[PDB]
Amino acid sequence: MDSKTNLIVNYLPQNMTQDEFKSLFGSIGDIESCKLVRDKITGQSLGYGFVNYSDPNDADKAINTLNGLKLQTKTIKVSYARPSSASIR
């Protein structure tokens, strides 16, 4: 069905984690399913998580407001979750 629910976040700050990542994109749209990067060994974050909204309108809004957030000493930025470029030559 036409919907497009791809919201990949990157540039996550240390404090940000599975809990700070849920509330962050949680008070913006019904993330049909979140999924921040969280190794299954020590638990170090890769500095980016995955999020899928329910509609494309709520997803473009999380990007029209969180796309380029400034931090005390870091730069966070939202980005549509897309697959590899898939090049050839």
H-run or E-run covering 58: helix 56-66
Q: Which residues, at least 6 apart from 34, have a Cβ–Cβ distance to it below 8 Å?
A: 18, 21, 22, 25, 26, 49, 50, 51, 52
From the number of C-beta atoms within 10 Å of its C-beta (0-12, 13-18, 19+), residue 88 rates as: exposed
CATH number of 1-89: 3.30.70.330
How many beta carbons lie within 10 A of that of residue 51, not counting itself?
26
Q: What radius of gyration, in Å, describes the C-alpha atoms of the chain?
A: 14
